[PDB]
Structure formats: C-alpha cells, structure tokens
C-alpha cells in the first residue's frame, strides 16, 4: 500500500513534427481509415526485426516465440489497441523515433497535403505513425524491448509527449499502441469496419492478425 514514486520525462516534439501533428488534427481529411494500415505496417516491420535478430541469436525469443498482431476494440473506454510481439522499443528508441528527431520527409509531406494529396500518402514520407491522430485525441504506446524495461509513451499532441517506466501489465516483448478515439471516430470500434479495413489495406501482412471482440 505505501505510496509509489514514478519518474516522468516530458519532451517537446521536433518543430515540423509538431506542425504536422497540428495539420493532421485540425484539417478535415476523408480516407482516415488508412491509420490502421500504418500501425499494422509498423507492427509488421517490428516483427521482421525480431524474426531476423532471432536467426542470429535464438535467445531473443526467450521473451516469447509467437510473432503476431492483435486488434482489441473496447466500446466501453472508446479505445482501439494494436498489439504486436515484434522487437519493441528501448527508452532511447521511443524518444528518438517517436518525436524528438527531425524526419527527412515531414516538410515534403506538409507541402504535398497543402497541395491536396490524399492523407493516404503519409506512409511514403516516413511519418506514418502520426496518422493515429486522424482518429485518436490521445495515443499511448506501451513497449518492451529485450534490452530494456517496459516504458510508456503518451501524447495528446499540443507539442509535448511524456515517457515513463511502465508499472502496468508486463508485456513480454513488443508494442501496444492504444488509440483513445475521438467522439466522432467510434466506427473504428466496430468489428465489421475493422475487418473491412484490414481486408482493403493490410491483406499482405506476413504475420497472423487476430481481432478480439468483447461479448
Ligand atoms: N509497433 C512498433 N514497434 C516497434 N517500433 C515502432 C512501432 N511503431 C513505430 N515504431 C518506431 O517508430 C518509427 C517511426 O514510425 P513511422 O512514423 O511509421 O515511420 P516508419 O515506419 O519508419 N516509415 C519506426 O521507424 C519505428 O522505429
Ligand atoms: Mg511506418
């Protein structure tokens, strides 16, 4: 019962990343559904990583042999969670890859959108993760890499994100991306819609994907 103390670190998003996030949140786009494709691709890439590292060193699957993606809608807390057993991210990975370091493509993507590009283009510009903000007012990333502890990344945009040691449910190895869906984006909690968009845009993923439906 004694009071637990948890360390938090707050970080500023690189300037253009912040500008991109604002643009994603504040402009209307049709075709927002592609966000799911982006997150499954990231999971896919992370699963490739672990599969390859494990040929080199089999003891990298100690933290779990199965390589897969799970989708978990929750109509009670209005969240959609994408879980993989890929490589995971170290603390430095989260800080460096998800927000503090400039991406080569950001500027090109913002011009391309200002010119009328379909939001679907985001993948090609190396900034696909931020498509989460088409549908989510807040995103939490839980992650565990073999070389590090479990950490939580979180941002409601607005220019900052935080990183902290995670003291929730141990994950083993991989990444859990939790989308707190905006009020008007709850269609992404529907099993038909999720099935629909996986079939359309994510049908050549090289790992099994399971959808967990409550009831
Ligand atoms: N599910 C995940 N597992 C491990 N690393 C991830 C995951 N999602 C994102 N990342 C890291 O975040 C980086 C940026 O993500 P993204 O914006 O999709 O660009 P990209 O995939 O590199 N093209 C990736 O390159 C990965 O390093
Ligand atoms: Mg990506």
From Swiss-Prot:
The modification N6-acetyllysine is found at residues 49, 75. Transmembrane segments: none annotated. Signal peptide: none annotated. ATP binds at residues 42, 84, 103, 129. It is found in: Nucleus; Cytoplasm; Melanosome; Cell membrane. Residues 1-215 are annotated as: Interaction with NR3C1. Changing residue 88 to D: Abolishes ATPase activity. Molecular chaperone that promotes the maturation, structural maintenance and proper regulation of specific target proteins involved for instance in cell cycle control and signal transduction. Undergoes a functional cycle that is linked to its ATPase activity which is essential for its chaperone activity. This cycle probably induces conformational changes in the client proteins, thereby causing their activation. Interacts dynamically with various co-chaperones that modulate its substrate recognition, ATPase cycle and chaperone function. (Microbial infection) Seems to interfere with N.meningitidis NadA-mediated invasion of human cells. Decreasing HSP90 levels increases adhesion and entry of E.coli expressing NadA into human Chang cells; increasing its levels leads to decreased adhesion and invasion. Homodimer. Identified in NR3C1/GCR steroid receptor-chaperone complexes formed at least by NR3C1, HSP90AA1 and a variety of proteins containing TPR repeats such as FKBP4, FKBP5, PPID, PPP5C or STIP1. Forms a complex containing HSP90AA1, TSC1 and TSC2; TSC1 is required to recruit TCS2 to the complex. The closed form interacts (via the middle domain and TPR repeat-binding motif) with co-chaperone TSC1 (via C-terminus). Interacts with TOM34. Interacts with TERT; the interaction, together with PTGES3, is required for correct assembly and stabilization of the TERT holoenzyme complex. Belongs to the heat shock protein 90 family. This is Heat shock protein HSP 90-alpha. It comes from Homo sapiens (Human). The lineage of its organism: Eukaryota, Metazoa, Chordata, Craniata, Vertebrata. The chain holds residues 10 to 224 of 732 of the full protein.
């Amino acid at each position: 019962q004694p009071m637990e103390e948890e360390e938090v670190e707050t970080f500023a998003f690189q300037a253009e990343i912040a500008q991109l996030m604002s643009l994603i949140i504040n402009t209307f786009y049709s075709n927002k559904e592609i966000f799911l494709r982006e997150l499954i691709s990231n999971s896919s890439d992370a699963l490739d990583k672990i599969r390859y590292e494990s040929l080199t060193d089999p003891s990298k699957l100690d933290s779990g042999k199965e390589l897969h993606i799970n989708l978990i809608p929750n109509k009670q807390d209005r969240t959609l969670t994408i879980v993989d057993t890929g490589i995971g991210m170290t603390k430095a990975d989260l800080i460096n890859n998800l927000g503090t370091i400039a991406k080569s493509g950001t500027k090109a993507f913002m011009e391309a959108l200002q010119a009328g590009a379909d939001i679907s283009m985001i993948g090609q510009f190396g900034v696909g993760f931020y498509s989460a903000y088409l549908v989510a007012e807040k995103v939490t990333v839980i992650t565990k890499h073999n070389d590090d502890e479990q950490y939580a990344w979180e941002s409601s945009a607005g220019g900052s994100f935080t990183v902290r040691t995670d003291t929730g449910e141990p994950m083993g190895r991989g990444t859990k991306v939790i989308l707190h869906l905006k009020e008007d984006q709850t269609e992404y909690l529907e099993e038909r819609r999720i099935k629909e968009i996986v079939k359309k845009h994510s049908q050549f993923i090289g790992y099994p994907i399971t959808l967990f439906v409550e009831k």
